[PDB]
Design a protein around this ligand. Structure first.
Ligand code: NKO
Lengths: 199, 196
């Protein structure tokens, strides 16, 4: 009853892909820019790093706010949190508002992890930052940090409901990156090299 | 032509009141109503959920065909979603003695607008958890559904369908409304709602 309310709320809140809303009022069509993704990385290409950080924060919140409510209400080992965090990420990937055409859910998933464990969230973000500074592919950093986020929760002793949530979310994130994976293997992925950040 | 076939099929399918047919499957016959709530009443939540899903599908299935084959702007969809609910309210297979059409109407709005449907389901859950009457939640979620379709800018064929379907549902709750105002409506326990 109460759990169903929270899970649906997490899905509806997650369905507000804020990169698509902000770019629309700024006039930009994200479909034609860079990867075509509606997420923070492509919002940065289309609108600049000022709007990319804003979109990252909002997409972060819609996974953090519902997951935190589940933790305080049902406990960290409740499967309500499992499906709440999944709902926020599935809302971002398949938004009920925009015809189920959303992003890859990396920022929203980090919001869910933050509500479960800030410690793991900051480490995974540090892992994401290093891999990115290393190779300047956001997709490679996101894939790596997604896998490291799962390994961090496991070693830290988090319950099987949290691990199940992380596996499904992580497997969904990698699957939504299959276009980036195809581009990385073929040397076509949109790098953030010298020319890209300069211009 | 083919539009009339869909409307009549929507009515006939909606006339399959599923609590009944699944109550008689397992073999049971309180409120005496044909509803998912009245099936959880009797055979447990696991069968009332299935009955809710089936009554949901008979409104969802013909309405999705209307959207896909005629368009969300078509008035074929208006009469198709109307026929499904009217089938559930006045089932030709059961002497026109049927339920209140909440689950069937939710199926109709979900095929038209998955967003409005889930938003209206949020309204129902909140009102039910807050005040603990099933009927008060169904009336409020019905009204909010039309308001959600209106402010979102859905076409006039959909707004007309929601008004007529909403009015029918509210009208089917006239006995619930009387008992609500006279304090004779059943209410769930303060703890019974959370374990519901
Ligand atoms: C299971 C929990 C996993 C948590 C996720 C890992 C944390 C990563 C740190 C946050 C990084 C900032 C947010 C970026 C969101 C985003 O935009 O993701 C899409 C990118 O990838 C690929 O971008 P693109 O080239 O446009 O497809």
């Amino acid at each position: 009853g109460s759990a169903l309310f929270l899970v649906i709320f997490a899905y509806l809140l997650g369905s507000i892909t804020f990169g698509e809303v902000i770019a629309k009022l700024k006039g930009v069509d994200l479909r034609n820019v860079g990867s075509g993704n509606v997420g923070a990385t492509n919002v940065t290409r289309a609108l600049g790093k000022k709007y990319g950080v804003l979109v990252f924060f909002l997409d972060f919140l819609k996974g953090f706010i519902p997951a935190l409510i589940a933790v305080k209400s049902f406990g960290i080992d409740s499967w309500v949190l499992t499906f709440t965090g999944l709902a926020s990420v599935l809302g971002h990937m398949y938004p009920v508002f925009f015809g189920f055409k959303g992003g890859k859910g990396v920022a929203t998933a980090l919001g869910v992890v933050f509500a479960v464990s800030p410690s793991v969230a900051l480490f995974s973000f540090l892992v994401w930052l290093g891999i990115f500074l290393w190779k300047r592919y956001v997709s490679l950093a996101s894939i790596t940090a997604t896998i490291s986020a799962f390994l961090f929760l496991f070693v830290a002793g988090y319950p099987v409901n949290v691990l199940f949530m992380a596996i499904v979310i992580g497997a969904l994130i990698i699957y939504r990156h299959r276009e980036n994976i195809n581009r990385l293997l073929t040397g076509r992925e949109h790098r953030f090299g010298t020319l890209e950040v300069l211009f």
